[PDB]
């Protein structure tokens, strides 16, 4: 009863792109993180700030859950302080991060013969994204002196790029589903708790 909707975020049928990561709020329920990390292989579970062994015996004000899909080698960039294409122009975590990061290989779900190209990622931006900033602008990136004028060409490129998830890819490029739990402890009756 009144268990937090953790199932509809992790086991959701279709994930969002990393550039348009999906945030689901968790409040007014009890949380049981024992139905999350099912060990397995290649699955990563790293808690930054709050230790995992006490997650079931802690109370928080809110729990935000960000969800997206990346590749294997870009999993390590989803961490506080790290830099890279994803960490700079797609999804940035603050330095005072207090939460956890879960990731698991989803090659059987987000890959198909011929290629699943529905997942996108931002390649260029004028500046790095601040923590928890979401940019969904499809404006042509201008790397040169001439205004691109809505079209691209010489020193003008598109900011979005398709991943290309094939079942025959390497582990480093297979699609990985990532869910980031951010725990917020404000100044109100703490709603989300554990056993």
């Amino acid at each position: 009863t009144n268990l937090c909707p953790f199932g509809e975020v992790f086991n959701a049928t279709r994930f969002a792109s990393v550039y348009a990561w999906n945030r689901k709020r968790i409040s007014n329920c009890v949380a049981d993180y024992s139905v999350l990390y099912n060990s397995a292989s290649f699955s990563t579970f790293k808690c930054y700030g709050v230790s995992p062994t006490k997650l079931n015996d802690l109370c928080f004000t809110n729990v935000y859950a960000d969800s997206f899909v990346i590749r294997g080698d870009e999993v390590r960039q989803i961490a506080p302080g790290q830099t890279g294409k994803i960490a700079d122009y797609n999804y940035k975590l603050p330095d005072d991060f207090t939460g956890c990061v879960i990731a698991w290989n989803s090659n059987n779900l987000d890959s198909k013969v011929g290629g699943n190209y529905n997942y996108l990622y931002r390649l260029f931006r004028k500046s790095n994204l601040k923590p928890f900033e979401r940019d969904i602008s499809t404006e042509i990136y201008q790397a040169g002196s001439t205004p691109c004028n809505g079209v691209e060409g010489f020193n003008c490129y598109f900011p979005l790029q398709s991943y290309g998830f094939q079942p025959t890819n390497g582990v480093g490029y297979q699609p990985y589903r990532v869910v980031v739990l951010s725990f917020e402890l404000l100044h109100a009756p703490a709603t989300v708790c554990g056993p």
Partner: antibody
Amino acid sequence: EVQLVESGGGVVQPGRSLRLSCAASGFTFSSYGMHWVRQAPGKGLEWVAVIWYDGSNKHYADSVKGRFTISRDNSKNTLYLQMNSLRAEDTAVYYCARDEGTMTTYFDYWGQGTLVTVSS
Amino acid sequence: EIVLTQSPSSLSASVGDRVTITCRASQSISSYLNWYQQKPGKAPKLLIYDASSLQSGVPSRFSGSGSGTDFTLTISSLQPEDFATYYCQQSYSTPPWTFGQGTKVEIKR
């Protein structure tokens, strides 16, 4: 008061398996997470594995994830570590430790340890 | 992961002298670090938890302090019972819990 007694160490040849146990006494076992941490003679301290309270989404370490298996038993107040396909570099003195903290995790109480030598 | 580096790796001090050991982290871990004492053959013992908190039973001569990426354990008055190795371990980004390489305190004569 708080006592942790390890048992099960000995001789293992490469590829085989071995089970280690850790009997606790002096606290409510079902309320603390447990840790397995090894120390190779010559090297320093190395964390191996951790199990939550009661037993849930156990967290391992790399070069161990698919090989070892940590479990527990609140009835017998015992913590178990089943090592499979032991390699030469797993030879070490093993300790079991407790968890503590509001958030965070530090090892407040340790056991005397037990020696595991893996060689052909 | 997070790599911890102790300094120095070994030292030689006399009784009553103030001893200082530093521990550096590859990234900010706030105050989520602890210290352990281990004598040859015996099991480790907890000394300081969460940067600057003294564990019960530990004498007041030990004191930890730090913030950010650089922490430091100091012994105000070294004693013969303190001939042991000292490890720093961070507990911010877990798992895995990462230990230091160890700082062996040696009694001079």
